[PDB]
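Ticket #4471: complex job returned nothing on first submit. Input attached below:
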Amino acid sequence: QFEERHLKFLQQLGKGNFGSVEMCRYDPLQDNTGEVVAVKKLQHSTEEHLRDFEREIEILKSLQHDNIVKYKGVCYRNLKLIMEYLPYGSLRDYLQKHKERIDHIKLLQYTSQICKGMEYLGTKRYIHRDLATRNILVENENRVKIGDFGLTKVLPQDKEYYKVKEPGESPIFWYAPESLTESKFSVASDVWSFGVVLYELFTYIEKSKSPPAEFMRMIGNDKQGQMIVFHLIELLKNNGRLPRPDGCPDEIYMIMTECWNNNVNQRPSFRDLALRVDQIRDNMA
Ligand SMILES: CCn1c(C(=O)N(C2CC2)C2CC2)cc2c3c(ncn3C)c(NCCCOC)nc21
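Support reply: We reran it on our side without changes. The output follows.
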């Protein structure tokens, strides 16, 4: 286990949903030979937030994959989740900084790792519900990991979807249509979001090219409030989609458009997505 007294604060790493992550050095010998770790806590402690957080901890403790951030432990009320520290941070920030150094085949290596981590979630009947480059972390220049499970839900034993409407700002521009209309989350809604992740990669996180910017442009910037959701629902229903990013090959854009099927059942599987990505990577090599 981990004691509060030996968790030395280094810096704030970020905030997301109702959580906050910080860089600490776990130094029990107080001789500065201790490991640097990532510490997640609730920005505002509440019992509803607490029970969610305890389920989140149980979800991460149960996952062991090369492309999933490692669970290290817990530190006690004022519950904290201890994870490994991934030195290159979010893929979102990393891609922007190394734009000119990261090519298409490297983007596809990352894509492949995201698919393998996501298929592993599916095998446990876990629904991520928040796939985005800001939630993917970089271990090194050749390895990425799904780095947060704040919205992750376990499917009911008898159902392939899970219904949930949480108070607060939902990442609607990554949501499948049935998530916007019916609050239905499944492996297939994660596949939809995965296409948005693949889109994000090929845009190299250019600000004007982000999914909110592109959708708001298509919807109209005059749209405000709960009306934005309505107009987005209508846009997707009429097969309005994110454009092919600049320089993206037609075959990579084809993967994105296939993930963005209004028909939940026609969306590819994470196993098929991995085969397709690996095949394209092999051809490029
Ligand atoms: C990008 C920042 N961020 C967040 C983070 O705020 N998230 C928000 C929900 C709260 C989720 C995980 C994405 C979590 C981590 C993290 C890191 N290493 C291991 N973990 C779990 C790390 N390393 C950053 C290297 C540079 O350090 C100076 N940056 C992180």
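The radius of gyration is 19 Å. Closing as resolved unless it happens again.
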